[PDB]
Amino acid sequence: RRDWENPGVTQLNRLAAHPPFASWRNSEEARTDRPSQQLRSLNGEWRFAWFPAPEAVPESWLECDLPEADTVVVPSNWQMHGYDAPIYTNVTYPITVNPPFVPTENPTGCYSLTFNVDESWLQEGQTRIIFDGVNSAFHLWCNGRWVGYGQDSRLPSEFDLSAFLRAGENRLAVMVLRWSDGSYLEDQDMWRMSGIFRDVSLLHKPTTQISDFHVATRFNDDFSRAVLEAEVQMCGELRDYLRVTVSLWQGETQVASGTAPFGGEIIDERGGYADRVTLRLNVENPKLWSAEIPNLYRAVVELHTADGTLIEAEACDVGFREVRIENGLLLLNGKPLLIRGVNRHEHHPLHGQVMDEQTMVQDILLMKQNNFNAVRCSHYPNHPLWYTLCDRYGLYVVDEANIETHGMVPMNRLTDDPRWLPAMSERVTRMVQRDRNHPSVIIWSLGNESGHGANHDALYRWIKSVDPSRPVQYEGGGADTTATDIICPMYARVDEDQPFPAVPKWSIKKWLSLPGETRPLILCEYAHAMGNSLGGFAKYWQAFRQYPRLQGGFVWDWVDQSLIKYDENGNPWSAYGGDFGDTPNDRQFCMNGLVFADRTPHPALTEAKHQQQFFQFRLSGQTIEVTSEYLFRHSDNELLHWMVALDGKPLASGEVPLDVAPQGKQLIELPELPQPESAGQLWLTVRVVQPNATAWSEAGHISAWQQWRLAENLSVTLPAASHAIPHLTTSEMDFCIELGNKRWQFNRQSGFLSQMWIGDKKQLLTPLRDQFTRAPLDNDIGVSEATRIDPNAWVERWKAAGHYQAEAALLQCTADTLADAVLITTAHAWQHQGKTLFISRKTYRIDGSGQMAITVDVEVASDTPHPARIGLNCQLAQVAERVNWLGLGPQENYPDRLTAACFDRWDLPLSDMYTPYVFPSENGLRCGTRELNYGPHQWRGDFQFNISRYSQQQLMETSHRHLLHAEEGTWLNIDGFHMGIGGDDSWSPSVSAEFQLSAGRYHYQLVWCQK
Template identity: 70%
Template sequence: MQQHDSHSAAAATFHQILAREDWQNQTITHLNRLPAHPTFASWRDTDAARKNQPSAFRRRLDGQWQFSWARSPFDVDARWLEDDLPDSRSTPVPSNWQMEGYDAPIYTNVRYPIDTTPPRVPEENPTGCYSLTFSVDESWRTDGQTQIIFDGVNSAFHLWCNGEWVGYSQDSRLPAAFDLSPYLQPGDNRICVMVMRWSAGTWLEDQDMWRMSGIFRSVWLLNKPTLHLCDVQLTPQLDALYRDAELLVNLSVAAPVALLEALTVKIELWDDDRLVASHQQLPGSPIIDERGSYAERAAIRLPVERPALWSAETPNCYRAVVSLCRGDETIEAEAWDIGFRRVEIKNGLLLLNGKPLLIRGVNRHEHHHQRGQVVTEEDMVQDILLMKQNNFNAVRCSHYPNTPRWYELCNRYGLYVVDEANIETHGMVPMNRLSDDPAWLPAFSARVSRMLQSNRNHPSIIIWSLGNESGGGGNHEAMYHWLKRNDPSRPVQYEGGGADSATTDIICPMYARVERDQRIPTVPKWGIKKWISLPGEQRPLILCEYAHAMGNSLGNFADYWQAFRDYPRLQGGFIWDWADQAISKT
């Protein structure tokens, strides 16, 4: 009887959650999702962090999960929260369910794959029900905070643990983390993930690509100690001579105020086995406002003499280790590869370390002909090596943030990256219908702010992009100014505002001709030679897309490159695109 009552209560809660239809509301970008942060591993000693050894406190949940498919969320049996449904079968995670025999992949460029009015999506909304049973060490259950992190789920999902609802997230291309600590139990634990193919977020994801669904990136468990680092921002800065440097570290600590006085934060900068610089101090920030002081924050400047500079040609990386300590004890350490480089625009030129860049770039989707949108580290390394062998030096993440490992590889191998927000509304009429609607500002802004908060520590990222083909509107203006305030160390680009847009530091048209103007009424495109000569125009020009390579073998390529060499402010471009999005499936 008690078990029946428990099931009835869980079923009632399940149906109440579905009745809210959170996925139909663009203002609900998440429920209970943790703030975005850089990739953490939560080492418990600095040596392991420095050497980037596998962390005992970060565990991958990839593998075989149980999966069942339904035509809509409302067709899912609530008993799934307790046990797998009769039609469930084993499926790999990560994967796209369309590549595993369920539902149909859809390829479309401009036209949306759904025919409803934003933010609504169809009631018949294919839904994947994933479940996994796992156990954790007792210390993970009783000490600190145990997070579950989904690197990518398309397009929105609800999460349950041991029958209790945990939270909700949309935005298919950025990590979503939740605190599992209150829900874990001794022995086996069961998580259930309900993934909706369509959500309000779908209206912001109208990219030219296959439309697929599922848990298509890795899933992780991360155990953070009770006292832990909850955010770390690393900003390398060079002096005016591009010779000496400092590492600006802004961090925040999760700890009761009463314990903060016993803690210190330590910053170490390593060049392989050589300690380059270090500093240790109490947490504490001079910031004071109506809340009072911020004792859990710290801003530290670490001087570095004559570091080896980072560029695509010389990707010199240092290992920055940030530790939270109590006396001689290391409570937690986090670490990242960083590079000292300075990105700026001066006299109409995009400069890296004081020298003009010539972008030999390419647009790249995350795609594999057998796995759909699931890419492995081997796939990524192969792409990078092919790019380097063929003299590419830059890649545009078209048109969304990539899997976190991609940036780490670009740091080490040496590629300049344009990191692009997961925003495209190409099929809207007019195209800026959503970007100029204040009701959509929270959804737009979350995608840009979380991209910055997740990826800002990577030296390979030299430019932020507000998205792709979404027209121009007030939401872009708000996002542009937010990025400039929160990261003045990088320029921001966006093509969609047209010739006179003030929301881009770089003129970044797509398919502008070398000589000939294209007098499109809404967004005229001048010949690129003429464009940089317009009265009052002082920005560099880098084509975000050009030389469309799908079947025409880079037409007029020599003309473009002659112009790039003849006109210093024409600083290259990104070929469309790296690889055909073919799939070996009928």
């Protein structure tokens, strides 16, 4: 049969999909959501053997364990146990595109289990097995007898074992195929693995049972009244004595309850459903569910007899909320949302695609703590627990069918084909059938990157028809097709259009008002966070707040998909595409998250948190106007804290509880600001602090901040009389300046400061030289490959221009003595292939005080590509424990990604000044710095810097962080100007014009002195 190469056969003997069941036989346990004796986990130790193809599997295996098999933990992805290599390919299918066929060599996972079954489960009722996740297709045998077949690696497949089991010891046999016709619809950009990777369980239901139930909540005009409607279906023999009671609870209080026999209303000429019944419960003043306040009730549905004998009970958490699109806006409980979303894959650096509650909770808490309120299940239905958690913790969820055919050419080749309709359909219908009762799901998604085909329009309608309660969305085919209620592009820019033919990405602002367009636009993906990215994030936040119909988006994405590998010494390191011998592969493209695989945040996360703050501020005079962006709750767990500091030195501060209604404003007058004695700039910082712990945060949690410069007092204070005069020593080859026990040497042929001594201690390992390039970022690189250059990428433009190859030719090097100083003057050209790319002119004024004042003026040929930076660099001989500075921090920050950073006095261990991106590149910059301290040195001015043990050269020659080695001394990069990092997407130039170094002529000044 090769059922695995036939999309017309997606399963055999599989039971209907339904909401989460547990078959409680006690109503209070169902009420309390306690573990059910009728629902058992078979997770644990199973038997496993790997085969190269289904054909190589021995018949024997069906009746008995293969000696050669191993004992392994289930759930798991067999690649994570080393049986075979996980593959990381983005768009290109990991198998030849020749649908519906798959390779003859098809890795086969044979799992088996010997377990007990109680007679009580067999003497009556129905016993079924549930495979929550099997990637990608499988055959099931029970006690050597064939049961059935299942496809769709992202939804549970259930089978009735009733007739196959026997009291006592039983044997399950599971043959899992790595590739199947289903893989054609599973082309998501992530690691390609296989196995039984989600839960395995046994569920017992009575023969007369609840076979399905739908819970709906509808409201009056101002949501002060609701009707809970519960449609219940049964299976088994109908009898007049059967009844269904549905009861609604608010904690221990029973809110409402309705009982009725089966027999629904007339549907058509043939009657109604004798096997269903709809209970209707009235609820006054329901407590509404929202990401802000996730209030839930509990619905308990009891199947029982007229005398009161309980047969069984099913149950769910219910959130009272209404989702609707009205007048072009997506409303929740009647208010327009502002989605602070993120896409999130099910990924664990050690367990691969196996999800545990701990990691789930970890993610949800970080998310909330970081001001996210929404999540998109990229790109398949999630492990069941995910929904319980979102319901309870409060996240708006986009549930998405497991459908992605990116690999086809054109992309809708399979989706526009009626022969793939059925397969696609089940991916949609079974998702709905499973998740329809979770309040956290507020939107349905047709899947991802499958172009736009007719099957999509058909599927869009089915849903709208069966569940009018949630909008349907879908990005394929241009993001605004007839298959979507929401304009939901991926990587559309704020202001700049990308008019691709057939599927342009318009500026979002512009897309809204295209002729005839009226829908809401919420990006399904934006601000691609690969490496040192998120450049321009604020720009999205500013347009979302200004335009009502711009309702947010989903950042791409939450966590890097890196895998843990171990070196010969047994140490672990983070691996990406190709690191397993997988080819072809897409290397680092699997690492696009705000947090590392291990949950440690990337610097970008803080930028996200600050822009997604729910409190907005304005300052006027001594007045601070705080506006709440909450739609439902009052600022009941917030205090505003403020502080005024002169150049990092605290002058005053204070606190005020916030008491602002959702969308309201609150004015706070600051007390008169005592004048200040001394030059410097006053800065006002405010912080929103939650005094009390919550289900998602700890007491003290800071939820928002903002700063403003206040008055500045310029220094006009004339220095002071130098106790000494520096001496100049002129030689053939060098200009030397000596002052006290300090010495500086400027080489005459190079034109650079090559050595500086403190006493007899040399301070430099490499001379102080201009620097115009940076170890390319992921964004600079784009998709360019040595194997296939992308001439338009930033890195390729710089290469080709000779930026990395350009060498300093000296034009001038003079020394002059002034009244109290020695002045060195130098001029250097950087050329390549006869073209002058940059010209740097400087002065070094060393004075009586030992301060070295450096002035830098640079010219950039207009026709050369704009450089990554314009700074100086050097390798210091010393290494120091801390880095102290006066400027923006404390975390890494770049021009287009510095909003979250605060101007203040920061002090960190040197290592915190390096950002360990898996794929190394320029990193650790801090901008707007007025003073930098390292060891005995201090640099003063208005610059950008990074300090670390790694040169830019090493960084750029190194592809994996674990392979970096600290060099001798400390590498210091001090930039007058640095280019923005971009990130609108990571495969095409994305740095906004305003962040390019295009002025042509640049000036900066610096003071290097000892402390």
